[PDB]
Design a binder for this molecule. Structure first.
Ligand SMILES: C[C@@H](O)CN1CCN(CC(=O)O)CCN(CC(=O)O)CCN(CC(=O)O)CC1
Ligand SMILES: C[C@@H](O)CN1CCN(CC(=O)O)CCN(CC(=O)O)CCN(CC(=O)O)CC1
Ligand SMILES: [Cl-]
Ligand SMILES: [Cl-]
Ligand SMILES: [Cl-]
Ligand SMILES: [Cl-]
Ligand SMILES: [Cl-]
Ligand SMILES: [Cl-]
Ligand SMILES: [Cl-]
Ligand SMILES: [Cl-]
Ligand SMILES: [Cl-]
Ligand SMILES: [Cl-]
Ligand SMILES: [Cl-]
Ligand SMILES: [Gd]
Ligand code: NA
Ligand code: NA
Ligand code: NA
Ligand code: NA
Ligand code: NA
Length: 129
């Protein structure tokens, strides 16, 4: 599924991602834009053989099982394919674990480089939330 901007904002808010670990909703929407262009089916292969999955490009090194990242963990205890569903519950629940792990949203490269230090509120501007 390719979410609309406000549609995704509403879903993320409903799932309690807004202000989670102190990160306002616009941060998450911005991150999703640049990680996946709001596409739940986004995947990207990393140099090391792991793969990033879903609207927040969660990696199989640590967070999900895809059966093709030897020696990896599955800390969210899900198949990586669960992160590709039209329903963002699994991605959101896993993202909460990630952003709690010490590094905050710096875990998302695209967030650090394209969202951090910017007007992130712009990403939820115009939405009825
Ligand atoms: C809770 C998360 O931290 C889990 N973690 C996510 C990624 N971490 C991020 C970082 O550690 O800030 C980077 C790699 N991490 C370095 C380290 O832990 O020393 C080694 C593996 N860790 C071991 C552990 O964490 O128990 C498992 C996966
Ligand atoms: C995998 C280990 O890293 C687990 N870790 C014990 C060993 N770390 C060493 C270091 O962080 O490489 C001690 C310093 N650590 C700083 C930091 O993580 O913020 C304290 C908090 N951590 C929380 C977590 O790691 O996320 C406690 C569990
Ligand atoms: Cl929308
Ligand atoms: Cl914030
Ligand atoms: Cl915001
Ligand atoms: Cl894909
Ligand atoms: Cl992989
Ligand atoms: Cl994701
Ligand atoms: Cl694997
Ligand atoms: Cl393969
Ligand atoms: Cl699995
Ligand atoms: Cl959803
Ligand atoms: Cl933080
Ligand atoms: Gd770690
Ligand atoms: Na914070
Ligand atoms: Na894995
Ligand atoms: Na498997
Ligand atoms: Na699993
Ligand atoms: Na999901």
């Amino acid at each position: 599924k390719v979410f609309g901007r406000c549609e995704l904002a509403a879903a993320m808010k409903r799932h309690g991602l807004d202000n989670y670990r102190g990160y306002s909703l616009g941060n998450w929407v911005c991150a999703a834009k640049f990680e996946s262009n709001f596409n739940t089916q986004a995947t990207n292969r990393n140099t090391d053989g792991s793969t990033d999955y879903g609207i927040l490009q969660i990696n199989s090194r640590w967070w999900c099982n895809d059966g093709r990242t030897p020696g990896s963990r599955n800390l969210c205890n899900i198949p990586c394919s669960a992160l590709l569903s039209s329903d963002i519950t699994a991605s959101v629940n896993c993202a909460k674990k990630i952003v709690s792990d010490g590094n905050g949203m710096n875990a998302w490269v695209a967030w650090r480089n394209r969202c951090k230090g910017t007007d992130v509120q712009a990403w939820i501007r115009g939405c009825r939330l």
